[PDB]
Design a protein around this ligand. Sequence first.
Ligand SMILES: Nc1ncnc2c1ncn2[C@@H]1O[C@H](COP(=O)(O)OP(=O)(O)OP(=O)(O)O)[C@@H](O)[C@H]1O
Lengths: 353, 87, 74, 286
Amino acid sequence: TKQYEKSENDLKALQSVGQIVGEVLKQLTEEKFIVKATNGPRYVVGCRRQLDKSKLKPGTRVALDMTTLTIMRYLPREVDPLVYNMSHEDPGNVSYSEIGGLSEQIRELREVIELPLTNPELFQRVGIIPPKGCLLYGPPGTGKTLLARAVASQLDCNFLKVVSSSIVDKYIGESARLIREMFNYARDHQPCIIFMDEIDAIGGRRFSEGTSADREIQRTLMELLNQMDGFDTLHRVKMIMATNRPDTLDPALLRPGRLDRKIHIDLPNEQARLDILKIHAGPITKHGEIDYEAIVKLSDGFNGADLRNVCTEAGMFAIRADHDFVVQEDFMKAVRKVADSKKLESKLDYKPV
Amino acid sequence: QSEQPLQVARCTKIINADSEDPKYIINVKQFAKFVVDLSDQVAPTDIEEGMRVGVDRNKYQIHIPLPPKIDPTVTMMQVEEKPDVTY
Amino acid sequence: THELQAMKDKIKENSEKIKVNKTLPYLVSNVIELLDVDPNDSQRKGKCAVIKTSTRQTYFLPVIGLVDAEKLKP
Amino acid sequence: AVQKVVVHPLVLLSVVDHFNRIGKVGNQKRVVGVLLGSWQKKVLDVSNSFAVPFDEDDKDDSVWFLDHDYLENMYGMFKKVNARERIVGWYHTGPKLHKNDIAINELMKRYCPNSVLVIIDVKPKDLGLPTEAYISVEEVHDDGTPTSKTFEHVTSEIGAEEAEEVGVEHLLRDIKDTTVGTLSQRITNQVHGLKGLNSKLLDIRSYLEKVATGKLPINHQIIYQLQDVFNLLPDVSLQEFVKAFYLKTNDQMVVVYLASLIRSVVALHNLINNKIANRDAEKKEG
Ligand SMILES: Nc1ncnc2c1ncn2[C@@H]1O[C@H](COP(=O)(O)OP(=O)(O)OP(=O)(O)O)[C@@H](O)[C@H]1O
């Protein structure tokens, strides 16, 4: 029962008041150390006898006391968006080769990513600069989020994710230090891979500057433009971006450097649609008599999200008939009808609104 | 003689959730959240979610709920003042 | 084996001091996961964490005490 | 284990003010209390403590009583005000310990793994830095005795702390501080020879005393082993400095040159600026 006495004595040590944290700036002398608290005041204070030479550091966060503001222990500094960035997930592996097309985009994205990791020798011996970035835009077909994130999730602890909602951040919020942090940790984990999706809102041009909120978009831009075209070495880390249209990217992003390789997604083709139907027919049960050319021919110019989810819509029409294994006749009904209904809903392609 | 009391009334704060019957939580202008009991002068049924109430900064228990607040600066003008244009 | 009750009284009085720690916070904090051990310079071992505030300040206090670091993600 | 300890003047007076307690009411023995230590590192530090009623019979020289009811509850009183503060051992004012102290330390080893007793001095006399520190270990012995518990001397040094120099350093007020650079180093030179050569003469007289009687101590061997470390140079007549002679004045080389060179410029600052400023005010006044 002495564990209670042990537990309460540990809570007696909890009577010790907590301290405050700050960032070291410089040092005037041994008895005065410039430290900037997270609030922004800067103090020059002494120190106690329990610390070492590793406490000083070149501008690293420290914990200031609440009385004399002296430093107790030092800890590594992070603003910690990254743990939130690593909270993503995705199956595959397999989903790499499941899309089926285009075969040239399947093989190339495997090279520019994996080859610099395993074989740097080809770059240094031939004397060529490997691509440090890439651009995958849409939606002329699917595979943007599927193929890129598959290698991401398979690369495990080495990856960086960016959602377009985190750039605006909060009122009078600072995303300029996020752009510098995103590329700072990109230079830590190697090779790092960064995904930026739906940049049309956060890629704001400075031609027409609305209200007070367009400039803070330009600030996040110029922070991206500086480090991607640096002057700061990104050669080992790979970057990826995504957008609906490259209208607002400006000559800065449309240029090479910051955006290196722009690979346009291609819609599924009758030859390639035969492969994507094989992977769709796996999870769904079918009748013993099935023809893959029937579904491929009846559905043309449809994205992979259209084909899959309508093939599940065919299963929802199949459960309307309660049959477990269903012939493709009931499928071709639900596949053609529901898909042709989707075509009269959204205008594009080809006509803009 | 009434100097000390009624001073503690600050500040105005909106409650959010209740962990138990005696204890609630209130968001206060200091930007934190106020986990509070209530004085014997006010029944627990008078404190409901999304209500502005008072406090006693000494004992920290709730003092009295204050419902009223009227408009921002923009809509207080939008309120009608006097009749005009009679038919 | 009768020392239990006298020892059980101090855990409630210390909890009574937690009951005055119950009433009442003016501060709400954000949590940051941290693991820190400093060799000196006989040995002091343990774990510490980083603590934010609603007033924009960021404080420094050892790992709580009460609820441990097993839960949860910050 | 425990290498060195740090004793503050605050806890020391806590032994001294209790000497005014048992001093006016009597009678025998001395001041004995339980020591509250603070361990932040291998070096030991002591801040506060509490004095406990204690008595030791003469006859009956081995009889001693600590009060554990005063030791238990008051610890919780101090544990509540100071969590890091805990009892590191006991203490007493000596001046000379008795063999019964083996029982006082072994009884309190249930509270702390190793109890360090501190012998203090209420009236400073001789020969030097006061009080004392002892640690309890077992060295057995070379002669074949049963396992022997003998307190080994621990180097003790006084130390200061913030906010505790308010009243302490104010009340004295009579000391001249420091003053480094003139009288500070030259006073110790008269002291380092005094205190250095008296313990010399005191120990060499005891070394001669070991021949007559008092053998053992044999010692062994620390007496002559550490003496021969002093014997790297004796130094004996005369100084054997034939190799260190031309080097001697060579150490006085820079010292005399910096003296004469700077003093000539200091004179140029003292003489010139004085005659200028003096001729200014003198002849222009009348
Ligand atoms: N060929 C496919 N096979 C399996 N699932 C797919 C396929 N295409 C799309 N999906 C599903 O659709 C979701 C979105 O994929 P992706 O980003 O590649 O297309 P998209 O950009 O959403 O297309 P659109 O913009 O036309 O909706 C994914 O979660 C995926 O599960």
